[PDB]
Amino acid sequence: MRPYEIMVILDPTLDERTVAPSLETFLNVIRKDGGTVDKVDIWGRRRLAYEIAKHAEGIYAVIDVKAEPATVSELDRQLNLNESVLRTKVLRTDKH
């Protein structure tokens, strides 16, 4: 299947104690499609370049999914419709 580098930014009102599973709740839908080996990092509370909705910092995270395009676009649809994300983005790890 295809690899990606899904970036996500969330509000600081959440907490590190609860960051990781919030992603997992979404990611399970991919996990039950392709045995999708994931390699996830969490680093937040980082100052931004410019305020989004009166926020100085955000919660960064990098979810290296190895899955299919339908599934990643569906995941993006879910992530954006969620009420907490400030932003998100999906770069392809392969040549394009």
Binding site: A49, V62, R87
Partner: protein, 84 residues
């Protein structure tokens, strides 16, 4: 010890100079993403604009992936653009 050019004492050296420089590929650079702000911001001006190849030294391949990652970084706000 020697001139900047015409130094037949040594091998034709692997040196970078005022006209010539190949700054990403050669050294000082780990991996080319928007996520690594520190390697990227070195290739900018003081005020947030972007440098030129004829001053830096890069090839268009390298300069354009640089610009790409810079611009993605500006959209994820890792790196500043200029605004009030």
């Amino acid at each position: 010890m020697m001139a900047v050019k015409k130094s037949r004492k040594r091998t034709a050296a692997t040196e970078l100079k005022k006209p010539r420089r190949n700054q990403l590929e050669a050294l000082g650079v780990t991996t080319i993403d928007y996520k690594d702000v520190a390697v990227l911001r070195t290739f900018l001006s003081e005020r947030g604009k972007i440098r030129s190849r004829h001053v830096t030294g890069l090839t268009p391949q390298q300069q354009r992936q640089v610009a790409t990652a810079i611009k993605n970084a500006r959209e994820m706000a890792l790196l500043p653009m200029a605004g009030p």
